[PDB]
């Protein structure tokens, strides 16, 4: 494939590894989810624009709409985690081991 | 009507901004159906030629298709000039 | 014995009892009528 | 795994035993590394060194089982002069199970492993001979 | 329409039926402190429903024909036996206390259901909020073990959190020596065995815990023995309460609907009173429970769901 | 939650699943999953406690990650085929990503860790939806893409799910975690037969949903969530202990009960393809499921555990819970075997 | 055959299940069992209580079951129709064999001694 | 039951069981062929419907 | 028919019903009635079927 696809596919993989390798802040990982959506938007937009798939031009817009619903949902849960524990640390969410 | 009319005069006193909003949104929803000029909007949009008009192969039996653009046959925009 | 509180189901719910028997009769009549249609249609398509 | 598996089955029984032990040891080491990766990821070691100690202990144990099996089963085939017999994999399988008991220091695990590793290895040779399919291709 | 989400949607909302006279009043005090009489007068003058204190056979009074059942169907727990032998080896003291808490929990749900469904307030005599004073008194006299206290607290935590405290808490403060005289004049032989240290513990818990706690969330009226005699003066006190505090101000139709769905489902109300914690005082062997359960089903009108018992005159069963 | 809000959110859960099942376009399939994920989170948080907050957080992170992998697969498929039609994928890397994404959404091993924890952390009513209705959308997608699924990958996921589901349930005393590990094991049977006969996948799915709904409804009726609280049921509703026994035996796959039908038919379709080792291994491993189902029957119906004094107060009140469809579900859960040839309606 | 149709029109050339079908009777029996379980879980007299409710349990089971059996029978007809049409279209894949009698076919004898 | 009825009832039973057994063998061989060659009603995995294509003259000629 | 002894007809009737259903099964297995090589014969002037 063309060389741009190398860097966009690399960007998605970097964000995916970022998502799968948590640190402490839950917000750091929610950022990696938004990054994953950014790389999909760019990769989808390039393919659609290059091929002149006219009707598909709206598809990246729809992707962003549900990226925001995902982001808003992630922040709402972060608020409730923050209220319960005083931090958004993910190691506090271990009650359900038992 | 009195209950609604009394309700109208109440919201004018308390929330005139929301009275205007619902009034404006209502005219948006309703007037396009009552307007007599709405039909021309589609006609104008349809008459704008973004594409080349590919000619038809004269098979010898399409009497309503113009041979030349200045021939009588075909759609006309006289309605649009008088608009 | 005689309940200190009137039971919720102390007396029949006649609106329900009527609907339940009415539905059963309707479904049975529909089923029988449907079956007769199928038998008649089946013989016609098969020249019987 | 596909390539390391072909190597083993592509070199005949009793011919080039050293090459056989390379393949089975390579399989065992890969299995031990996979076990270490999941173990280290799901039960965090107390320190980086302890994670390395646990990995090297599992990977060596798994490679030792693979080495003793691939060697013994090849030696049995060579000595017995019967390269098609499942019994060789039973002897190799049990020996691997015995080594597992050794690395674990537990005759009971050694005995149980010898039985089930031995039988499992014997079943593997039979399936190879007869064409038994584990992940059978859809046909009907 | 039985109350549910459908009834709520169609309009059955608590704030429609609830007025300024929809209050939950609890009357508390020591033994022989005059609660019962004061509670009955307050209910009659304010026009509320009166709930006589929940005893051993409270639950029988609400199901079946409303008459007390034999004592084997209450666990054989006896209040008289508690006075005769507070340190019984069969665990009667705590078993009785655990049974009584559950009876109060049930009565509170019934009071709340009446208040939310009709808007008429209610008057109780003690409640789940003040039942612990007896437990604390029992423990300080050595009538129960620390484990019984732990079990009581586990049950309370997961039950009392679901309800709202009373609007008004009325306390009748009768000093212990006066109570001892009152118990002595009453006459029943078993209650005469109560020791003053036991009654002082009830008083210490009432003032050391209940009242400071209730104050932050309820209107508290603390009367002496003489003030309490004239119920008219107490009613006057209640009528001019401001009601500026407590969790009732934060209630809305959405929340009271969730509360109504709980208090009308008694098995849900009593869910955690039988948590699988095996204290000897309350654990019943399988052979005993099986036998008693069979005998309970053989009582008049208890084999089947209410309204399906032909032995007691229920008709139209084949259509019900 | 307002009753009208609850109904609207439930209909959005169903609409999201239905969008996945009627869509011919990958974008609409992805939208359906997103809409479904959006509406289920408030159902998980409906009780507002730290365990429900943790459950919902773990669910959102897993589902949202899987959706990214799903959308990645769709975009790769678009690059190598120039179309969005829901069907076989045209790139093996796109097939791996979509298969892993659907396995994540299904909670199949080794992507299974969230199922026991999320189910434990939410109410019984919400767990019922999670372990039944939520399997429909990912399964319907697999039903359409299976021609391009890697056979070794899907059978590896199926085998690991049966082992981990069976082993995991052995150590549980909480009912919700028992149902979660049971669900993981049953998912393995569904996807093991998928490459061979997808019709048998639907039968297993339908029968599993009926039996799972029956169990959750009976747990809800008594408001029981632990083994020990379920052991008091004999001293309250004896009939319910018998229904629980019959369903648990059925879920274990014992003849002549319904739950034996899917295992029977899946073994048939696998042996027809000369798959002998795998169905034998699966059936023997499923004996772990039967073991910890049997333990429940022992503590619930076949013995009488100790009770408490306060239980006597429960004798005086009738069951008030809706128990919707329970009489029908339990009959279907147990008495369907004589009608097995009815599976052709699913073709 | 027809897309997302429960009973394609071609299915009407088949005879409907008889209302005395043994499978339909079993389905009706299941409806009866459901009615009894409904009474039992609600502590109503199992046999007698709510006969109208029991009737609807039987009738609704029979009603749904009749259409399932009608579709079940149809799908097996389609399976047979497809299989025989395929055999006609590929004779060389399904040759008719020459059948030999046992007097001609050699079978080994294994003594049981 | 007399031997003749049982005897001839057995032949009726044997005929049905023999006919079913042959069909089962035919079904397995038909399924094997249909799946390998894709030339039959079964294992007919959908391709894109060609009625979706638009054959109108486009904005540019070379398509 | 008494209120005290009607239950004693359930099993006898099940036997009669089971006997009856067995005979109706024999009516679906007549493909070789009077057609086997061993027993095929002619019908006696008055007979209808060799076995029913
Ligand atoms: C295309 C290329 C791929 C694209 C990615 C390119 C790279 C770009 C960056 C991508 C994002 C990376 C995100 C890293 C991250 O956030 O993790 C933080 C993660 C947790 O953060 P933390 O809270 O600060 O903890 C710090 C200590 O680790 C805390 O240590 P401790 O207190 O827990 O002490 C015990 C420690 C002991 O550690 C061990 O046991 C090590 C044993 C290893 C066996 C040898 O336990 C562990 O560390 C176990 C985890 C080790 C990782 C799993 C290995 C198995 O820490 C790390 O694991 C460090 C990793 C950083 C390098 C990442 C390299 C990425 C390559 C991934 C594979 C590529 C696949 C293709
Ligand atoms: C402990 C149990 C581990 C079993 C060993 C699995 C193994 O080593 O097999 C490797 C396998 C290669 O076999 P392969 O030829 O690619 O499969 C096609 C079959 N005709 O690799 C595969 O492709 C199958 C994946 C096996 C996963 C094992 C976990
Ligand atoms: C798709 C292809 C995937 C193939 C491999 C799938 C295996 C995934 C297993 C993940 C689920 C099981 C998790 C588990 O088993 O627990 C973690 C386990 C810890 O066990 P460990 O600490 O090593 O033993 C201590 C002895 N004192 O850690 C382990 O050691 C489990 C190793 C399993 C490797 C297989
Ligand atoms: C049809 C072809 C398909 C074949 C598949 C098999 C068909 C059967 C499917 C079964 C489905 C579940 C329905 C079973 C109905 C059970 C009826 C029953 O349990 O009796 C009611 C009774 C309830 O007691 P109660 O309401 O309190 O009345 C007073 C008596 N105490 O119950 C009790 O009092 C019992 C309390 C004590 C517990 C005893 C437990 C041992 C007896 C279990 C027998 C049922 C086992 C069913 C499992 C399948 C059996 C093959
Ligand atoms: C232990 C349980 C967990 C592990 C799973 C068990 C599987 C491993 C056992 C292997 C048994 C041998 C086997 O699998 O045979 C496969 C064979 C395949 O041959 P096939 O291709 O279908 O036919 C044409 C031949 N070229 O199959 C055939 O040809 C047909 C054989 C008939 C089916 C046999 C089923 C397997 C029986 C194995 C267990 C038998 C011992 C039972 C032990 C009972 C214990 C109390
Ligand atoms: C075929 C299988 C059909 C399965 C029928 C399921 C019946 C479940 C009914 C259980 C008892 C009644 C009940 O209340 O269910 C719980 C839930 C409602 O929630 P609840 O806690 O009761 O109160 C809500 C107020 N906030 O009720 C619900 O929200 C329904 C959740 C179940 C929906 C999925 C059922 C399985 C899939 C159905 C499609 C079949 C394929
Ligand atoms: C011709 C019919 C032949 C019978 C075929 C049976 C096939 C299995 C059907 C399972 C469904 C059974 C019905 C559901 C249980 C309802 C009965 C019950 O729960 O309690 C018994 C009850 C009497 O107790 P009570 O609650 O007080 O009601 C008074 C009514 N006179 O009600 C009664 O008075 C008696 C009602 C029947 C009792 C059923 C007992 C359950 C049997 C389960 C065993 C498994 C079935 C056998 C396995 C082979 C299946 C063919
Ligand atoms: C696969 C082969 C086997 C075939 C399997 C077929 C399964 C599907 C077949 C349907 C199974 C469910 C049948 C339910 C029958 C019992 C219904 C009943 O008796 O309800 C009585 C009464 C409500 O009756 P009502 O709704 O008012 O009737 C008028 C309808 N417009 O009110 C009551 O008291 C009923 C309370 C008990 C009901 C349990 C909760 C479910 C609610 C059902 C609502 C009404 C169902 C109507 C069924 C019609 C279906 C055609
Ligand atoms: C020009 C024709 C179109 C006019 C449309 C106007 C629509 C206005 C919508 C309401 C906007 C006002 O916003 C708020 O509405 C609520 C009711 O919801 C009003 O409050 C009202 O509540 C109920 C009716 O619902 C009445 O019993 C109450 O007496 C009245 O005050 C408030 O006065 C106002 O603060
Ligand atoms: C043809 C190729 C044949 C390949 C053979 C592959 C054999 C399978 C090897 C799997 C990996 C080894 O598996 C692992 O072994 C080590 C032994 O040190 C065990 O570890 C256990 O025993 C010893 C001592 O007790 C220590 O490692 C450790 O303290 C303890 O946890 C683990 O419980 C086991 O999970
Ligand atoms: C605890 C018990 C757990 C379950 C145990 C199950 C035992 C299963 C035994 C393995 C089944 C057969 O296993 C597999 O058979 C096929 C033949 O079809 C062999 O396949 C091989 O055949 C040819 C030659 O025959 C080789 O050149 C080639 O490398 C390979 O394709 C595999 O080398 C063998 O690994
Ligand atoms: N152990 C125990 N006994 C209780 C409890 N509530 C009431 N009692 C006993 O029940 C009896 C009646 O209590 P009181 O109402 O306070 O005494 P009284 O004679 O009725 O005087 P009044 O306050 O006017 O009603 C007393 O013997 C109490 O000790 C309780 O929660 N635990
Ligand atoms: N094995 C598959 N994956 N396909 C499949 N079901 N093949 C079998 C063909 C079949 C079976 C039943 C019916 I009814 C019909 Cl019409 C067709
Ligand atoms: Mg009193």
Coordinates of N, CA, C and O in Angstrom, one line a residue, chain E residues 297 302-305 308 317-320, chain G residues 42-45 48-53:
Chain E
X297 N -49.0 -24.9 57.1 CA -49.9 -25.0 55.9 C -51.2 -25.7 56.2 O -52.1 -25.5 55.4
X302 N -54.5 -21.1 55.2 CA -53.1 -20.9 55.0 C -52.5 -21.8 54.0 O -51.3 -21.6 53.6
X303 N -53.2 -22.8 53.5 CA -52.6 -23.7 52.5 C -52.3 -23.0 51.2 O -51.3 -23.2 50.6
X304 N -53.2 -22.1 50.8 CA -53.2 -21.4 49.5 C -53.1 -19.9 49.7 O -53.2 -19.4 50.7
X305 N -52.9 -19.3 48.5 CA -52.9 -17.8 48.5 C -54.2 -17.3 48.9 O -55.2 -17.9 48.7
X308 N -58.0 -18.1 47.8 CA -58.1 -19.4 47.1 C -58.4 -20.6 48.1 O -58.1 -21.7 47.8
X317 N -63.2 -20.3 42.7 CA -61.8 -20.6 42.6 C -61.4 -21.0 41.2 O -60.3 -20.7 40.7
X318 N -62.3 -21.8 40.6 CA -62.0 -22.2 39.2 C -62.0 -21.1 38.2 O -61.6 -21.4 37.0
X319 N -62.3 -19.9 38.5 CA -62.2 -18.7 37.7 C -61.3 -17.7 38.2 O -61.1 -16.6 37.6
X320 N -60.6 -18.0 39.4 CA -59.8 -17.0 40.0 C -58.3 -17.3 39.9 O -57.9 -17.7 38.8
Chain G
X42 N -47.8 -19.9 42.3 CA -48.6 -18.9 42.9 C -49.4 -19.5 44.1 O -50.3 -18.8 44.5
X43 N -49.2 -20.7 44.5 CA -49.9 -21.3 45.6 C -51.4 -21.2 45.4 O -52.2 -20.8 46.3
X44 N -51.9 -21.6 44.2 CA -53.3 -21.8 43.9 C -53.6 -23.3 43.8 O -52.7 -24.0 43.5
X45 N -54.8 -23.7 44.1 CA -55.1 -25.1 43.9 C -54.7 -25.6 42.5 O -55.3 -25.1 41.5
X48 N -57.5 -27.2 40.0 CA -58.8 -26.6 39.8 C -58.7 -25.1 39.5 O -59.6 -24.6 38.7
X49 N -57.8 -24.4 40.1 CA -57.8 -22.9 40.0 C -57.7 -22.4 38.6 O -56.8 -22.8 37.8
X50 N -58.5 -21.4 38.3 CA -58.3 -20.6 37.1 C -58.4 -21.4 35.8 O -57.4 -21.5 35.1
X51 N -59.5 -22.1 35.5 CA -59.6 -23.0 34.4 C -59.5 -22.2 33.1 O -59.0 -22.7 32.1
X52 N -60.0 -20.9 33.1 CA -59.8 -20.1 31.9 C -58.3 -19.9 31.6 O -57.9 -19.9 30.4
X53 N -57.5 -19.6 32.6 CA -56.1 -19.4 32.4 C -55.5 -20.7 31.9 O -54.6 -20.7 31.0

